[PDB]
Structure 1
Amino acid sequence: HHWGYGKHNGPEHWHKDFPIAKGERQSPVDIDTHTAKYDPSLKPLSVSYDQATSLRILNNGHAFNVEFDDSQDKAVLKGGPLDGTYRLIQFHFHWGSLDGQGSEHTVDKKKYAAELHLVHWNTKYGDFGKAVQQPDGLAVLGIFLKVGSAKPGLQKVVDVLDSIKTKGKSADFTNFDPRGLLPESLDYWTYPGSLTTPPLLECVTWIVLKEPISVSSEQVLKFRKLNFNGEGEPEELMVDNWRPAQPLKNRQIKASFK
């Protein structure tokens, strides 16, 4: 597989190797704020990251993943629309070449500069590989980034990117606190969807926070200096690694707030 984000291997091509690309519950989507309905029975959302153990950061030639030790319930997401316990395995971002694009979800067609995905798997399925095969296997917490003031809790990420410039590079990344990437409010929208990269599996309960976080232009500029290519290959800047909005089809987006 040689998928990517260019003209020749980008989102419009994915359906040929991954037919589920045209499925009934694909992500991302546009969130129409005037059609999403407040759901008074959503239970409170619970982000328990106090014991989180980050291990490593990896440039995978599409984005960078910050990886966590998920061998026990150290950093978990529960509540909201979720039944049971979901374990944090990694986070990554999607971003643009320009500040007016980059996010995957959109809000009344508004694109943010970037979008953070904290990826969690349902522990009743035992491992991540089994979880991606289930309709309720993953919960992804989505957070929009806008360009404004710097996010202090992000700077440790920005500063290690020099060391993982090219595809296949990784670096030790211990003692990173993902609580520093959260906005004040946990108000959210939720809907059933999919992974937004191949294999595009329809296994995600999406929880997208309404409140974006602000990051500085300098911070996002450093994302844009990463490379999709491997070391010693011709340089392709890692920008515009976002899949555009997919048909909502027979789904409802629910709001946690009035």
Structure 2
Amino acid sequence: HWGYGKHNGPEHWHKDFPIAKGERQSPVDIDTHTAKYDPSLKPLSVSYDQATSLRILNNGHAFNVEFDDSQDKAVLKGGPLDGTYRLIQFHFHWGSLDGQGSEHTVDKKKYAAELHLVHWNTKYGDFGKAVQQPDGLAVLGIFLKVGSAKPGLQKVVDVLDSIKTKGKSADFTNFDPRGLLPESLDYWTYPGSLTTPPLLECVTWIVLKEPISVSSEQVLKFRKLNFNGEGEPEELMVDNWRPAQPLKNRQIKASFK
């Protein structure tokens, strides 16, 4: 089973998931000087007012806050996207130290963590079909830096004690993901992939320029989670990020000048 350890981490993934060495892998370094402003890019439309969170799950790789995606309740549209993409879950990647944890980097800078809000293109009917399409998913990525607390994150932080180990889930209703966004929706965008196996090349990445700030105490609580299941040897869930992959034949576009 793949993971983030010395013996099953990102350098090993290609042996079971050969697309790991593909033409549009994620994450990437965002070279801010080389990214080109695209004045034809529309503003993002984030419509989360009717979002229905259901549950939070430790899946052994991260924790997912899951949403009801059986109707257009929380959707992403506009920007580089054609059509409507429904929010299915969000999760984070984070480090063992404040100086690493993000998957995307900005001029080689690593942030302490990165939030991924995962959406699937409604024209494909469900998430499983969507991941088989080159325009199946839109993932909104948001960097986290350590400073002031993010009040809208605290409800997530406080439930983590109940899902410490792999396979644990807890009810998690009425959570409003709007509380996780920064003020600005300026973004970079490029075609890429899932950043974990199966590494499918199905994602339009939309990475916000403005990080959110979270407190040291908030990120410390992420680091108390476990990769392992209950009753197994404890391995802290930290450094669950894939490093930047070759950009290859891609251009990163900026929504802003």
Structure 1 and Structure 2 fold alike (TM over 0.5)? yes
Give the distance between the partners of 2:27 and 2:120, measured in 1 at CA: 18
CA distance in 1, matches of 2:156, 2:97: 20
Render the CA deviation track for 1:140-185: whole Å, top value 9, x for unaligned.
0000000000000000000000000000000000000000000000
Q: C-alpha displacement at 1:138, in angstroms?
A: 0.1
Q: Does 1:194 align with 2:176?
A: no
CA distance in 2, matches of 1:27, 1:21: 9
> How far is 1:113 from its partner?
0.1
Q: Distance in 2 between matches of 1:239 and 1:210?
A: 24
Q: C-alpha root-mean-square deviation of aligned residues, in Å?
A: 0.2
TM, length-normalised to structure 1: 0.99
Q: Give, in whole Å, the separation in 2 of the partners of 1:78 and 1:144.
A: 20
Deviations, residues 67-95 of structure 1 (Å, cap 9, x unaligned) = 00000000000000000000000000000
**1:124 aligns to what?**
123
2:191, 2:124 → 1: CA distance?
18
TM-score (norm. length: structure 2): 1.00
Query: For the residues of structure 1 that align with 2:165 and 2:130, how far apart are their CA atoms?
Result: 29
Please list, as runs of the form range in 1=range in 2, the aligned pairs for 1:95-244 lying within 5 A after superposition: 95-244=94-243
What is the alpha-carbon distance in structure 1 between the residues aligned to residue 9 and residue 177 of structure 2? 30
Post-superposition Cα deviations, 1:108-166, rounded to whole Å, max 9, x if no partner, equal 00000000000000000000000000000000000000000000000000000000000
Render the CA deviation track for 1:39-58: whole Å, top value 9, x for unaligned. 00001110000000000000
Which blocks of at least 5 consecutive residues in structure 1 are unaligned?
A: none
Q: Supply the distance in 2 between the matched residues of 1:26 and 1:82 (Cα, whole angstroms).
A: 19
Tell me the CA shift for residue 37 of structure 1: 0.3
In structure 1, how many angstroms separate the alpha carbons of the residues matched to 2:81 and 2:179? 23
Q: 1:23: how far off?
A: 0.1
Deviation at 1:63, TM superposition (A): 0.3
Q: Deviations over 1:6-62 (max 9, x none)?
A: 000000000000000000000000000000000000011100000000000000000
C-alpha deviations, 1:179-215, integer Å up to 9, x for none? 0000000000000000000000000000000000000
Q: State the secondary structure of the residue aligned to 1:93.
A: strand
Is the partner of 1:77 in helix, strand or coil? strand
Identity of aligned residues (%): 100
CA distance in 2, matches of 1:63, 1:251: 28
Task: Give the secondary structure class of the aligned counterpart of 1:46.
Answer: strand
Unaligned regions of 5+ residues in structure 2, if any? none
- Residue 200 of structure 2 aligns to a residue in which SS? coil
Partner SS state of residue 225, structure 1: coil
Which consecutive segments of 4 or more residues in structure 1 shift more than 4 A? none
User: Aligned partners of 1:206 and 1:63: how far apart in 2?
Assistant: 19
- Partners of 2:173 and 2:159 lie apart in 1 by 12
Alignment partners' CA distance in 2, 1:32 and 1:208: 13
